DNA sequence: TGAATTTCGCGACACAAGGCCTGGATGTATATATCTGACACGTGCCTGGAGACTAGGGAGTAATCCCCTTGGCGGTTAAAACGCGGGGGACAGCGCGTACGTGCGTTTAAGCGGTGCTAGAGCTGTCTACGACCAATTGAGCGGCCTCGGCACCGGATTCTCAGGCCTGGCTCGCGATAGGGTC
DNA sequence: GACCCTATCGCGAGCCAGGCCTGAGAATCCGGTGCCGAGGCCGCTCAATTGGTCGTAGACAGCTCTAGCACCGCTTAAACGCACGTACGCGCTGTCCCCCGCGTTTTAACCGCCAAGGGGATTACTCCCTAGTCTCCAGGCACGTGTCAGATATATACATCCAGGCCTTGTGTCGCGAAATTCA
C-alpha cells in the first residue's frame, strides 16, 4: 500500500537533478577547516582569501567528478554496477597519478 | 585553536552527491575512506605548490591566483578565478 | 501417423513430443508452478535396444508453461538452456516400432512417460 | 595630424591590435615582434571567441533562456568535437557536467 | 479399424473414468454393469486381470453379466488389452 | 587605484555582432577573459619556441600561422588560417 | 514406516513382477498365492481392484488365501494402494 | 614429440623479450608505412634514417605502455586474455 | 603498407609489455591505433619541416613533435 | 680561476649563464642563479649516475648502457615520479609480472 | 656542436672511479641535462614574471627546484645549491 | 431376413472467459504575479595607443660544395604465413547471503545576520648595491688520430627446469550372511 | 522360545590421485677469438674572464584602509542512526571455440656495393622593418543609476495507471442420422 519505488529510481532522479544543477556539493565550513588544517602542516599561521578557498573547492569537486566518471567506466568494464575501491585504484593507476 | 581531524568534515552524503553527479548509480560502503584519502593527497599536492608560491612572494595570505597557478602547473587549468 | 501415442504423467512435467526418428525429445511443465528437475534422468527404450540414460545437471528447473527440448547429437541443433538441450554424447534417441520414453526423478521414480507404438 | 583609425579598424577586427602588440612586447616571448603578427593573432582570437559565443548562444536559445551563463558555455564547449579537443584540460567553474547516462545503466 | 472412443480411452489412463467410457459399453450396458457392482472402469479391469487377459473368458463373462454381443465384447476386450499393453 | 586590464568590451562587441539580442553574465565574462588569456599564452609560447628553434629573433606572421596550425585541430586550423590571411591582406593593402 | 521392498515396488510399475515382489510377502506366502492361482503381482492387484480397494476386505482375503498376518497384510495393502494412487 | 603446455612458452618469451632491448618491428615495413603516411600531407619529403628510427622507437614505447595498461584492464575484469574493449577503455581513461 | 606491421610484430610487442594471451581482433585495432598515432606525430613533424622551408624531415623535427605531445624522447638530440 | 672551481662544482657555470642569457628567459639574470642551477644539475646527475652504477654491478657488467639507466630510473620512486612521461631509447622495461599471471 | 660530455665524464669518474659510459648513454645524459635545464629555467621565468620582477635570482631558482623536484631530491638539491652559493660568495 | 440394439458423429442452444471502450485518481509540465540585485547604459578622465622619422642590424636573396638520400641489383637466409591438434580460457546461468538503498525520527552544527579590529596587502618615496656592456686576454674545451681491450660471438660443459610413465593407495559398488522384529 | 522375513556389515573388484624417476630442452657458466669504439693525446681557437663604468630594480620605511579572523545568536537543512527489504556480486559449473605450439613452404629484409644530384650548410651583399624617441589625443576604465530576467512560488491543463462495463469467441451438450451386428 505505501508508495515505495524500486531501488534505483530515486538514484536516477538524483543523477538527473545533480547533472542538471551546478551548485557546490560540499558544505563550505568543513572543507575550509580541512584546508586550514592541511595548510598548517607546511607553514603555521597562514591566511586564506575566501575566493582562494572557493577555487580550491571547485577544483577538488571537478577532480572528484572526473575520477568518479572514470571509476564508473571501470566498474562497467567488469560488468558490475557498484563501484569498489579497486576500481578507483585502477583508474588512478591508469591515469598515472600513482 | 589548533585544527585536527577535519577530514571527517567531508561527510558521507557529500561524497554520495559527488558520485551521483558523475553518473555513479550504486556506491559501496568502503568507498568513503578511499575518497577521503584521495582528496587528502590531492589537497596536499595542490596546497604545497600554493604555499610555495605564497612564500616566494613574502606574503602570509594565499591569494586565489596562487591556487590558480598551482592548478595550472598540474595540467588542470581553472577558468573563472583568473581576474 | 501409423504410430499410436500413449502418455501418462503424475507430476508437473509431461512428455509432450517425441521425435519418431529420434532427433529430439520434448517435455513441458504443464502446471502453473516452476518445476525443478535437478539430477533427473530419462531412460529411452527402443524395442529390444539397450537402454539410453540421459542425466540432467544437479540443479535445473523448468519454469511453468515452458518447454525444454533434449536434442540428439545428429539433429545439429544448438544447445540453449533452459529451452534447448543437445545430447552431444548420443547421436540419436533411436528408432523402432516400439519407442518408450520415461521421465525419472532424482529419487529413481518414473513420473512421466510417452510411448510410440507402430502396427 | 591625419585622422587616426585603430589597426583593428584597418583590419576590420573587433579585438584590439595595439593591446595584443603591447602584450607581445612585454611578454618576453622574443626580442622582436613583427608588424602583422598582432593582426594575425587578433584575427585568430576573434574567430575563436565568435565560435564559442555562437555555440553558447545557440545552447541558451535551446533551453528557453536569453542570457549566457557558465552552464551554457560548458554545454556549448563539451558538445563540439574540436573545441572539446582544444580545451580538454580546462575546468569551467560552476559549469556542471554533460547530461549523459551509460547505456547499460538503463533498464533492459 | 479402431473406434474413436476406444482411441480416447487408450490414449490416457482410465483413472476414475466410469464404466461407460469403455469402448463398446454404453448407457444401458454401463448401467447394467454398475447395478451388478462393477461401477467403474478399473473395477472391470480388475476382473479382466483376474481372467488373465483371456479373450474368451472375459467376453463370455461380459455377455453373461450385461448381455453384450460379439462386437461390443470384442471392442471392450481390445480396449482393455491395449490399455494393459500401453500402461500396465 | 591601479588600472586592471581585461577583454570585457571586446567580447561584448563580438557577442553583439554574432547575436544582436543576447546578454552575457559577469561570470561568463570572466570565463571568457580567462579563455582569451590562456589561448594567447599558448599561441605566444608556441611561437616563441618555434622562433628559437630556427635561430631566429623575430616573431613574424609565419611563426604565428605555424603555431595556429600546430595548436588548433582540424577545421579550426583552416578557418583561423583563412581569417588571419584575410586580416593581414587587408592591413597591408591600406 | 515403509520397507525397502515397499519403496522398490512403488517406485516402478509392476509389469511382470512375481507375487513374491510384493512388500511383506515372503517366499512361503508367494508360493501359496501362486498355488491358489494368483501367480503374479498384477493378478493380486486385480483382486485389490475387485474388492474396491477396501483395506479390511483385502487383508482378510489375503489372510484366508495365503495365511498372512496383520503386519504382512498391512504392508501388502499399503504397497498396492500406493501403486494404484501413483500409476492408476 | 616433446610439447609444452600453452602459456609456458609465452612466459619464456616474456622473460626473453623483457631482458632484451632491440626493436621488435622490422625496419623496412615501418619505413614504407611512414613514407606512405607523409604522402597525404606533402609530396616530395625526404627522411633521415635517424628520424625514422626515432619514430619507430616512439611507436614501440607507446604501444608497450598501451599494452601494459590493457593487460591491467583485462586482469581487473577477472580475465587473462586481452580484448579490443580493454584497449578502448584504456585509451578513453588515459584521455585519448 | 599498413599491412607491413605483421601479426608477429604486434605479438612480440604485446609479449614485451606483459600480455599473456592475445585475442584475434587485437591486431586490426592495434594497426588502427598505430596509424592514428603516426598521423598525429607526422602531421606536426611535416609542419615543422615546412616552417623552415626544408624538403627533408630531420630527427629534431620528430623529437620536437614528440615533445609537444607530452612524450619526451631522449638520445636522438640534437 | 674558473667559476666552477670557485663554487666547487664540475658543471660549467659560464655555459649555464650563457644559455640563460641566450634563451630569452628574462631581461636580466642574477649572479648566483647559474651557480645554484649548476649545483642542482650536478646533484641530479650524480644521483642518477650513482644509481646506474649500483645497477651495473648487479648484472656483472662494467659499462653503463641505456638499459642500466632505464633500470635505475624506473627502480627509484622519486626519479620515476620526476620522469614519468619520458621515453628512453634502447631502454627496455622493468621486469613486472602480475601475481594472477603466475600459475597456482 | 656543444654538449655536456666532459662534465658528465668527470662526475662519473668522481662517483665511480672505475666505470665507463658508452656514447649513446652520454647522449641520453646530454638530453636529460637539457630537459632539466629547460624545465627549471622556464619555471624560474614564470615565477619572476608572476611577481612583476625582471631578475632571476637564486631565490627563484630555489623556489623552482622546490616546485619541480619531489620530496627528498628537493631537500638535497636545496642543500647543495645553498652550500655552493655560500662557497662561491665566501671566496 | 427384418427388427431390435447399439455406437459414432453432426448441428442448434447455453455458457463462461477473454478482449476492447470509457472515466477517475494520480503526478507532471504550463502560465502568471512579484521583487530584487545584478546587468546594461551614460559620463569624466588620463594614460596607453597612434603618427612621423631615423638608424641599424636581421633577414632575404644569389652562388657553391659535398653528402647523404634516393634508386637499384644479387643472396642468404631469418622471419613470416598457413594448416592442424588441442586443451585451456571466456561466457552464460544459477543460487545466495550479505551488504547497501530507502524511509523516518533525531540532533547538531552549518548558514545567515551583524560587529570590531588589526595584521597585513597595497601604494608611495629614497637610494644604493648590483648587473648589463664593452676592450683585452688566453687557456679550457672542441676536432681529428690512434690504440687495445670490453664486449659480441661462438663452442663446450653443468645444472636446472618441465613433463610424462609406473606403482601404491584410497574410495566406491555390489552379493551374501548374522542379527533384529514380529508372529505364534 | 521357535520360526519367517528383512536389514547392515565384510570383502572382492575396478576407477581415480599423487609420488618417484628419467629424459628432452634450455638457461647458464667458462674459455678462446676478433673487432671497432671509448679513452687518451695533440693542435687549435674563440668564449669565459677581468676590470671598470653607469643606469637602475628593488629593498627598506612608512602610511593607509580592508577584509580575515574572531565572536555571538537564531533557524532549520541536513547529517545521523536505526531497521528492513531486496538485489547484486561472488563462486561454481558446464560448453565451446580458438589462439598456441609446432612444423613446412615462401619471400623479401638486410647487407654490401655502386652512382648521381637535391638540397642543406655555408658565405657575401644589400635593404628595409622595426626599436626607439617625441608629441598628440581619445578609448576604455572607474563610478553612478535605473529597470527587468530570472528566481520564487501558486494555480491549472495534460499524460498515465487502473478499474468498471460492454462485445466476441471458443466450448460442452443432447436429440437424432448413419451404419454394423445378433436373435426372433
Numbering used by the authors:
A (entry chain E): 37 to 134
B (entry chain F): 20 to 102
C (entry chain M): 428 to 546
D (entry chain C): 11 to 118
E (entry chain K), G (entry chain L): 2 to 89
F (entry chain D): 31 to 124
H (entry chain A): 38 to 133
I (entry chain B): 25 to 102
Paper excerpt:
Barrier-to-autointegration factor (BAF) associates with mitotic chromosomes and promotes nuclear envelope assembly by recruiting proteins, such as Lamins, required for the reconstruction of the nuclear envelope and lamina. BAF also mediates chromatin anchoring to the nuclear lamina via Lamin A/C. However, the mechanism by which BAF and Lamin A/C bind chromatin and affect the chromatin organization remains elusive. The fundamental repeating unit of chromatin is the nucleosome, which contains two copies of histones H2A, H2B, H3, and H41. In the present study, we show the cryo-electron microscopy (cryo-EM) structures of BAF-Lamin A/C IgF-nucleosome complexes with or without linker histone H1.
Therefore, these two complexes, with high and low mobilities, are not artificially formed due to cross-linking. We then conducted the cryo-EM single particle analysis with the high gel mobility complex fraction and determined the structure of the BAF-Lamin A/C-nucleosome complex (cand Supplementary Fig. 2a). We found that BAF-Lamin A/C IgF is located on the dyad region of the nucleosome, and each BAF protomer binds a linker DNA, tying two linker DNAs together in the nucleosome. The two linker DNA fragments bound to the BAF dimer in the nucleosome are perpendicularly aligned, consistent with the orientation of the two DNA fragments in the BAF-DNA complex reported previously. The side chain moieties of the Lamin A/C Lys486 and His506 residues directly contact the DNA at the nucleosomal dyad. Consequently, the BAF-Lamin A/C IgF complex binds nucleosomal DNA in a tripartite manner. We found a previously unrecognized DNA-binding interface of Lamin A/C, including the Lys486 and His506 residues. In the BAF-Lamin A/C-nucleosome complex, the BAF Ser4 residue is located close to the backbone of the linker DNAs. We determined that both the K486N and H506D mutations found in lipodystrophy patients decrease the nucleosome binding of Lamin A/C in the presence of BAF. Therefore, the nucleosome binding of the Lamin A/C IgF domain requires the BAF dimer.
